[model samples]
Target: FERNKTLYWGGALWSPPSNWNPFTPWNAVAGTIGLVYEPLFLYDPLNDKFEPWLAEKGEWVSNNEYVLTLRKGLRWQDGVPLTADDVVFTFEIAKKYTGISYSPVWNWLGRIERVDERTLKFVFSDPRYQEWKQMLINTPIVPKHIWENKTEEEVLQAANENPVGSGPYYVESWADDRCVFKKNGNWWGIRELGYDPKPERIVELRVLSNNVAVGMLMKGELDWSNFFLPGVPVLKKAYGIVTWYENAPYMLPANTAGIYINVNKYPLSIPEFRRAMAYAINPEKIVTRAYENMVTAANPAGILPLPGYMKYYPKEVVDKYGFKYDPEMAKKILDELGFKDVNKDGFREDPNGKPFKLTIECPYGWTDWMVSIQSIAEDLVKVGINVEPKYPDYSKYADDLYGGKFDLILNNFTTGVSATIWSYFNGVFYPDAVESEYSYSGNFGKYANPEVETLLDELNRSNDDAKIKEVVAKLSEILLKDLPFIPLWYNGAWFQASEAVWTNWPTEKNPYAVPIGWNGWWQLTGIKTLFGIEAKH
Candidate 1:
């Protein structure tokens, strides 16, 4: 193996890299998005900055319109020039298929008009400024020539063994064990962003297990990894593995880990019952016992605790309506609500005088979540609630998750990004009247409130900072009161890069990027990291 010129990476991807279509979500490897197909802008979530990539600049000309200018002389790997048509087609295709990742854009976007080969004007009827702007920085621009001829089924589900992209890398080979992406010598980034990536070849390997990944990183077989390896202190001292921080909670907080209570269930459907459950468990205990301080406790609102979005934490609202660990309070609420231990079996019966047992479930092999839920069940049991923790295989667990087939489940809607908190709000509230529309994505618990829906809409429509803050405060009050999703903790982004072959990996000292090695993050931060790192001879 060519250690210097070839970069070996693992951890984020588990299975073989098969599909290469960028439109099909979570099916392709890392290079498929950030390296092969490029978004118009690259967002730095840590700094809350959106750097222009394919687009030279974009601005809102009016409340309902935004104009984007593409850098000239950009060409695809097939030597075809990238133009406004490609951008227009990329968005128009979403209209034809509502299952694609960008389908939600149609709810707020009106039309996209091409002014010239390199300029496009995005017109919106009801402008969601926060969402639209976020989409600009994350949405991939596909070539019109390549996709226009494909059938609907093919577009939605295709292997696309030979993918053509306009970014800096092209798929070289893919097998059951690995996927190789080689640099495109004529990538437009060289002329536009003034960046030429150093590594000629990047090989993404399938990760089998965390311990296996740890062993590979220790031996310098893996250059970059996003796996959650245990005992990082020993690894850092003995093998020289690097993370975002050197102290406790060594990795950056990526997403909120919460227990999604199914409102469709009997006792779980009661708001008072839900509020009682919230006060029963201790998040800090989960942080210490389950994750060993590798993660941090999430705020009551489940808002990302990063500096970029910290203003929306709503401390006062939480003071009034939020919950904390109090076993006495948990039992008191249940006692007042007519839940009594009539049978004298030490477990309380429901208000109807019927004994019932519930289960809190998480996917198997997620040791952190499994341990956290076990603690949760024990806490709830102290309040006379007969609850147990269950771990099922990921395949069946996902089916039960999206199908709303469980009493309670551990889940995260999406990872927090540089995008507005509106994305986070929408992810949990899901504002759609149709259950089928939201069953597979947000609102997995099927918790519904007309007030939450209206407030989410208000957040989307208003760009005024004060108005958005006001809306968030109101939503926080409802969220804390309802306890639809009880925020347990903030899980780490899970990054570890070895400096055996490539030096200058981003860190707290040299914060060039977010230092994530995940799939979509490659376009966001990994591409920038590639330019900043150097070969260690």
Candidate 2:
């Protein structure tokens, strides 16, 4: 372990970050989003907290106006002073260019104005817009001088090979598979406020496979990574592997994983057929064997399918249509749905006595999920439902899934405490129906119920707890009655870090800061402060 200055990080990035402009598409990964480009504030959805980054303080001047005060004497890595004008330009330019990342920001932002050198004000179209605060807090603040005269085409598609920022780190160099960031020498926090990062440099390397990433971690080649390594028990002795909590179910549920079915297809569109498929696979088994018991599987009480969301599930509905994990139940439903095993082949035939087989596809190289679907395939095949698993590269995999090339696809939906179940349900089940595309634009099933869409419409407009709960319960009723996407397991915010070099990284117990690996670490002068990541001398 001789490398003292450089710390290698393994992340979920399929490859090195290409587009350096944080305001464009394919710019969603961790290395660029928060590491290079600083957001005003970073959201820790698990804890329901927002750590202020760029702005020293923010005050809701009025219902529609929010004023932010930037820290004094802030300087971009280019040596230009970070003024209110740069902040305004970041928004105004994005508004003019209109990239997918900032559409939410430009949608409601009326007229942003600079009150003074250090002061800036936000005037939202609606005073009570719930998403407005979050959108601004998460939006990356780009530089004015660097991109003042750049066109939309130049900015969006720019390599931005040398990204200069006022954040904690800047891209030193990049290869095809890795992007290395060197600590900003004059980083405002270190130069001005005394914050520091332990490593001399951080290298983000994209590992081809999950096993290789863990192998690198075990060998001390990787300091931090995003993975669900099953052998958590082997880490303490083999390497200085660190997790925040000392217990079972090591990671917290950050979101939910579901099997997205194309309801437009035959037999799958049938409610009885779907109900049979839902119970055929034991989700709890997948959680235990595949992830090594590091996650909580889906439950009936978890209608929204979040751990605490069980409380909001209606009592009658929970009893009637919750997860039962009974193959007999599946068999009964299939039988009633007119799926008969005419061919002695043990797989179900369609209602019209036609041959039927389901192919489930998930992205390759994802270890935990690959094993999960395999387990599902086993559980399903045993009970007269023949299912095959397929692996495609991530880009093509996504293309096929959303493009309706697969019968069922494993996907995720986001859920957090501050946000209601609406984000989860509305996104997958009740997507925006009207689309400019020739194909059905929204809904994985590509099918929508006006009734469910109406409920989702009501849910979207209001953040009221009671109203959310009421509408969510109604939607849950529809979800169970019509199994469009079967909720499988809670998607763990897969993160793992080794303490071979840098120490005092965040854990569940310390909670000083959320670990930087899973796209949460870098914000405004983030991780550098409060993080005790000093190297072992």
Candidate 3:
């Protein structure tokens, strides 16, 4: 019965890496595919901390330098020993392919040096102490022997098909649509930790659409599903599953989603027009009607995962634009901007004698949410603006926004408090002074505010937590004034499990630590001791 059990999951998009390669910087592949590979450090989601995986321990050598000591006696699936060379080699390859979207590993890492086969050190040009730890744990370590000689294209192709890894499981087969992972019986961690492996047979990750996956879950054909839409309230209730909501540590605060306009674009270049657009649309109705009350109202200031996490967010910014929902005020601002219906038509015209028309681009498959966007477009039309909605595939969506082809776009950025805000400000909203091609790739709206950029740079450079908070507050204030992107709603993580299958999954104090599938780092060794699973070593 245990061998027969399989955990089936679904996602809206399928841009997975061809296979697992430590050198390839891919988030979706890294996050999900890593379930079949091992990283140097395993982030313990339960404790909200990091645990040594390949490395025995990691620490900062100086303000901007970090050192990691690898655990002895670790070997890859092919029996080759994993060493510091692999760690250094991984970073080196990543740095060479720096402009790729998944190049966060290289972007954050300044330089790497191998002290010995067991020890590795990294030096950051601009040090961020708190973020340094996150960077280390999140970076996956690859084997030098496998990837050292391969060219970038060769590595990408080889890694996407058949890959070698040193994790709990390894790729067993890759069929047309399904990927199978077999447990690494000779895996390095099993004997060292003295824990019995849970699943002995191959784990099949079958891809399915949202509707098909939901049906599979109801029929008990699947064990887990990650992507869920708002319209599935009945399905959720039918499964006896409770709707769970938790803030993603690295994403914008919950209840803020909207079009981030390119301030560089003409017509939208005026602050009055931007302000009118912000005020004219009612956020409360957007949350209630559009999200079906699943999302919270957009807080124009900023959303912090934990209260008091960021010290810089001042009360003044919150007071000025936190929750201002006024249509009349919006109309007045438009009127002041010289917007009028000279033709007696319902829509308004710009004071410069041009009709207000703009394209709103969003990813396809967001049908229900798009309806809500149409509602906002109707609201803008009342004041003389005509808004057109454009739907494109997810990949094209990224291209249009990052390539600067769209007038306005609605998208989400995933990151924790410090790095998430940093990416929003420095990556997409403003350019970095360092002048690397990848540095400002994410700032899709091409917004440039010198003062805000300075504050973001200050925050990025400072190691002191207290000073970082102050800089963050300044950044928030500037964002309030500029309003490059209309803050919409923050997303929350939800999970439903059979109590019989697992208990004490996570809590506000512990949260769902370690990433999802790799809960074994903490919970595995203690499962028998804590929950009496009878499989302890």
The digit string of per-residue lDDT tens for model 1 on 190-307 reads: 9876898888888888754566788889989988887778888888889998888977678888888888888879888899999999988889888888888998888888888876
Among the numbered candidates, top TM-score falls to 1
Measured with C-alpha atoms, the lDDT of residue 160 in candidate 3 is 47
Off by over 4 Å in 2: 25-29, 59-63, 94-99, 104-109, 191-193, 301-321, 401-405, 413-422, 433-457, 460-463, 520-530
Which 10-residue window of candidate 3 scores lowest in summed lDDT?
A: 524-533
lDDT for residue 301 in candidate 3, whole number 0-100: 61
Best by lDDT: 1
Candidate lDDT scores, in order, read 0.81, 0.69, 0.56
> What are the C-alpha RMSDs, in order, of all predicted structures?
2.3, 3.6, 5.2
Which residues of candidate 3, in runs, are more than 4 Å off? 1-3, 15-33, 42-48, 94-113, 153-159, 174-178, 194-209, 231-233, 242-256, 308-310, 321-323, 415-441, 497-537
Clashing pairs in 2: 244-507, 244-508, 302-305
Ranked candidates (TM-score, high to low)? 1, 2, 3
lDDT, candidate 2, 141-260, per-residue tens: 888988888887887677777787777788887776788788787877676556676666778787667887878888778887766576876785567687756666667665668787
